[PDB]
Amino acid sequence: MSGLRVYSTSVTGSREIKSQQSEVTRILDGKRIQYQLVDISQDNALRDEMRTLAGNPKATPPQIVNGNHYCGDYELFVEAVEQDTLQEFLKLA
Amino acid sequence: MSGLRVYSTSVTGSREIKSQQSEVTRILDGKRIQYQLVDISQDNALRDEMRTLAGNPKATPPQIVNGNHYCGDYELFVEAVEQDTLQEFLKLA
């Protein structure tokens, strides 16, 4: 596969991260949009890749990318859901 | 017009209710499903209606109804999304 990807973590104490990643993936599931779910837990290279693509060394999941194009984070994903620009956000358009 | 109503509250100290009701509606908005958003904090007669329809005197938002037909709560809604059966859950089919 090469295309849309969501970075997530399966092990974390953060309620924000867990709520936000679950919302992103459930919205995508609701729209029947295919994506690769990447779990970064205990793999620093995955965490670093996510951070490099987001251009933010403190980024946390969820983070969405399509190929090597960064799409954005939770806030901008939900903005696109509400404003109906999710095809553009996700670089599917 | 769907007949769909989502019971919600605009005033709560529960992070779980806020999170859950946001997820329901963002998923519905993602799918372009129309619904009336009912805010039970506007009066207890609405909370009363939600609870008798849900069959549970301790029910909290979100709760989803299509007309007089109760569809379910957060957990049942998420199960329908993850199992690809939202249209049946919402009694749109």
Positive or negative, the Cα torsion across B87, B75, B49, B53? positive
Maximum separation of any 2 CA atoms in chain B, in Å: 36
Query: In this structure, what token pair is assigned to residue A25?
Result: 């993936």
Q: How far is A31 from chain B (nearest CA, A)?
A: 6
Q: Vertex B62, ends B61 and B68: CA angle to 5°? A: 100
B1-93 CATH, one of 2.60.120.10, 3.30.2320.80, 3.40.30.10, 3.30.470.10: 3.40.30.10
Query: In this structure, what token pair is assigned to residue A37?
Result: 């779910």
Identify the residue among A14, A17, A19 best suited for mutation to test binding to B, counting B beta carbons within 10 A and taking the highest.
A19
Q: Vertex B9, ends B55 and B25: CA angle to 5°? A: 85
Maximum separation of any 2 CA atoms in chain A, in Å: 35
On chain A, the residues whose CB falls within 8 A of the CB of B27 are 26-27, 30
Identify the residue among A27, A74, A82, A84 best suited for mutation to test binding to B, counting B beta carbons within 10 A and taking the highest.
A27
Non-local CB neighbours of B58 within 8 Å, separated by 6+ positions = B51
What contacts 24+ positions apart, CB below 8 Å, involve A47-55? Answer: A50/A7
Is B26 at the interface with chain A, CB within 8 A? yes
**DSSP character at residue A37:** E
What contacts 24+ positions apart, CB below 8 Å, involve B52-57? Answer: none
Is B75 at the interface with chain A, CB within 8 A? no
**DSSP character at residue B58:** T
Whole-angstrom Cα distance, residue B33 to residue B54? 21
Whole-angstrom Cα distance, residue B30 to residue A11? 27
How far is the CA of A65 from the CAs of A6, A50, B36, in angstroms? 7, 9, 33
- Could you tell me which of A59, A65, A52, A44 has the C-alpha nearest to residue A2? A65
